[PDB]
Design an enzyme around this catalytic site. Structure first.
Site, PDB file in Angstrom:
ATOM      1  N   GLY A 123       0.746  -1.153   0.016  1.00  0.00           N
ATOM      2  CA  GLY A 123      -0.020  -0.023  -0.009  1.00  0.00           C
ATOM      3  C   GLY A 123       0.687   1.462   0.017  1.00  0.00           C
ATOM      4  CG  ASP A 206       2.425   0.278  -9.157  1.00  0.00           C
ATOM      5  OD1 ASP A 206       2.699   0.932 -10.112  1.00  0.00           O
ATOM      6  OD2 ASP A 206       3.263   0.134  -8.140  1.00  0.00           O
ATOM      7  CE  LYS A 243       4.232  -1.813 -11.647  1.00  0.00           C
ATOM      8  NZ  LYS A 243       4.521  -2.131 -13.128  1.00  0.00           N
TER       9      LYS A 243
HETATM   10  C1  SAM Z   1       4.503  -3.424  -7.586  1.00  0.00           C
HETATM   11  S1  SAM Z   1       3.409  -3.915  -6.429  1.00  0.00           S
HETATM   12  C2  SAM Z   1       2.032  -2.600  -6.637  1.00  0.00           C
HETATM   13  C3  SAM Z   1       1.762  -2.235  -5.453  1.00  0.00           C
HETATM   14  C4  SAM Z   1       2.658  -0.904  -4.994  1.00  0.00           C
HETATM   15  N1  SAM Z   1       4.122  -1.691  -4.372  1.00  0.00           N
HETATM   16  C5  SAM Z   1       2.084  -0.196  -3.867  1.00  0.00           C
HETATM   17  O1  SAM Z   1       2.251  -0.508  -2.580  1.00  0.00           O
HETATM   18  O2  SAM Z   1       1.628   0.962  -4.170  1.00  0.00           O
HETATM   19  C6  SAM Z   1       2.566  -5.260  -7.592  1.00  0.00           C
HETATM   20  C7  SAM Z   1       0.955  -5.225  -7.258  1.00  0.00           C
HETATM   21  O3  SAM Z   1       0.131  -5.942  -8.611  1.00  0.00           O
HETATM   22  C8  SAM Z   1      -0.631  -6.769  -7.867  1.00  0.00           C
HETATM   23  N2  SAM Z   1      -1.232  -7.548  -8.785  1.00  0.00           N
HETATM   24  C9  SAM Z   1      -0.473  -8.337  -9.730  1.00  0.00           C
HETATM   25  N3  SAM Z   1      -1.001  -9.283 -10.630  1.00  0.00           N
HETATM   26  C10 SAM Z   1      -2.425  -9.059 -10.284  1.00  0.00           C
HETATM   27  C11 SAM Z   1      -3.777  -9.540 -10.704  1.00  0.00           C
HETATM   28  N4  SAM Z   1      -3.682 -10.261 -11.967  1.00  0.00           N
HETATM   29  N5  SAM Z   1      -4.963  -8.822 -10.422  1.00  0.00           N
HETATM   30  C12 SAM Z   1      -4.599  -8.109  -9.279  1.00  0.00           C
HETATM   31  N6  SAM Z   1      -3.505  -7.735  -8.621  1.00  0.00           N
HETATM   32  C13 SAM Z   1      -2.524  -7.975  -9.349  1.00  0.00           C
HETATM   33  C14 SAM Z   1      -0.203  -7.260  -6.779  1.00  0.00           C
HETATM   34  O4  SAM Z   1      -1.358  -7.820  -5.903  1.00  0.00           O
HETATM   35  C15 SAM Z   1       0.682  -6.246  -6.093  1.00  0.00           C
HETATM   36  O5  SAM Z   1      -0.352  -5.367  -5.293  1.00  0.00           O
END
Ligand code: SAM
Length: 392
Positions: A123, A206, A243
């Site tokens: 988050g 993201d 993103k």
């Molecule tokens: C780079 S992190 C994004 C959050 C970021 N670090 C923040 O805290 O703002 C990767 C994110 O992509 C989400 N994610 C990846 N594949 C997903 C999918 N198929 N459906 C939903 N969320 C997905 C993960 O749950 C995770 O929250």
């Protein structure tokens, strides 16, 4: 090592895209692609080639350790998160926190009060907006829903704040696990989001998988659900932060083409807090001008339902926009990213055995860059009464 001593801070990279006056037809056939796609394809091969240059290092674990050490050593913003977290009471100050914060400070959003932050776990984005909202916008109260693929919530932002997250734990399979590649989940998440928070002025997503030669491609369905969720929840006038990565695939291009029908302003951005050596981009839409028709909604969900990367529109109709995208791809990827990967390989070669020395060379430079960031995106101390409840 003069080349070291002369390294300069990057600039925030913002590339405007043209809105498309014309009405949007979502294609159902294939169309012959415009010439310029060969140019994007030429960019994909090139960017993939430079990336390949680190292939030799990836074969022995030894050199691979030295590689990441060298990459760590060149990361000019490394101890900024911790400076920010302390100097100003910030939370979940991941690198994502700085990116969202930098985005907030640059983009001049008309409104940041009602935020649906998807693919958000843990988050940082949510924390960034909370902090920016209460120290710069001074919105009386700040309301937000969030969702993410149920697994991580390292800080207990999901655990402490369950009236805000929109996905369930496996114990509820009975049910939306926040996976935005399932069409029914995206419809459900958008409905939930608009069912407990209206309107939605800011949508952020993201999401990303990880693996590099097919990173965009591996992520297409993900980046499409991401955006389908937003466009099914973002209210007229609202704002959007998505993103992406390379933007060379014809699907991505067609997805950006869809977006250009829905905002007053549209941009491709590379924030200085986004690693200059990776392909991460942030598509940004300001001032949503209109909602989906009921037909537009069904066509896109069905494409999510039965997915193929065939372009969603006729790309030949968006020549001008396409020329603007390549211009971001030339700026962000063909120049900046390639300039910085070459730079890291060069460092590797002259300092694979002298890491401490490289870090010593770059300490002064580091402080100046992190100081610049803080002067560019002014930060104020967050009041403890306006902090997010964390369970960890
Ligand atoms: C780079 S992190 C994004 C959050 C970021 N670090 C923040 O805290 O703002 C990767 C994110 O992509 C989400 N994610 C990846 N594949 C997903 C999918 N198929 N459906 C939903 N969320 C997905 C993960 O749950 C995770 O929250």
């Amino acid at each position: 090592y003069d080349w070291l001593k002369t390294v300069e801070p990057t600039n925030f990279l913002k590339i405007g895209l043209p809105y498309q006056a014309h009405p949007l037809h979502l294609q159902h056939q294939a169309t012959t692609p415009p010439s310029i796609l060969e140019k994007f394809k030429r960019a994909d091969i090139l960017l993939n080639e430079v990336k390949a240059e680190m292939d030799p290092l990836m074969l022995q674990p030894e050199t691979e350790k030295k590689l990441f050490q060298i990459l760590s050593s060149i990361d000019m913003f490394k101890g900024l998160r911790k400076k920010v977290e302390f100097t100003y009471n910030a939370q979940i100050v991941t690198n994502a926190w700085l990116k969202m914060y930098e985005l907030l400070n640059t983009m001049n959003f008309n409104n940041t009060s009602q935020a649906f932050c998807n693919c958000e776990l843990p988050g940082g984005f949510i924390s960034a907006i909370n902090h920016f909202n209460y120290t710069m916008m001074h919105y009386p109260t700040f309301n937000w829903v969030a969702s993410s693929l149920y697994p991580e919530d390292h800080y207990g932002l999901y655990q402490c704040n369950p009236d805000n997250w929109l996905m369930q734990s496996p114990l509820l399979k009975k049910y939306n696990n926040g996976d935005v590649t399932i069409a029914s989940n995206v419809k459900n998440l958008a409905l939930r989001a608009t069912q407990r928070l209206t309107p939605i002025h800011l949508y952020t997503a993201d999401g990303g998988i990880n693996v590099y030669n097919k990173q965009e491609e591996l992520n297409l369905k993900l980046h499409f659900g991401q955006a389908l969720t937003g466009l099914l929840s973002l209210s007229k006038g609202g704002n959007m932060i998505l993103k992406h990565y390379t933007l060379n695939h014809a699907f991505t291009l067609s997805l950006i083409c869809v977006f250009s029908h829905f905002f007053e302003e549209l941009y491709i951005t590379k924030p200085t807090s986004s690693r200059p050596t990776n392909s991460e981009t942030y598509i940004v839409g300001k001032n949503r001008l209109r909602l989906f028709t009921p037909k537009e909604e069904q066509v896109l969900l069905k494409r999510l339902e039965f997915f193929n990367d065939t372009p969603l529109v006729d790309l030949s109709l968006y020549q001008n926009l396409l020329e603007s995208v390549y211009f971001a791809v030339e700026t962000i990827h063909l120049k900046q990213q390639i300039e910085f990967l070459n730079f890291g390989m060069k460092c590797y070669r002259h300092f694979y055995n002298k890491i401490k020395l490289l870090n010593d060379y770059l300490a002064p430079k580091k402080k100046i860059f992190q100081d610049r960031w803080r002067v560019l995106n002014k930060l104020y101390v967050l009041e403890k009464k306006h902090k997010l409840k964390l369970c960890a």
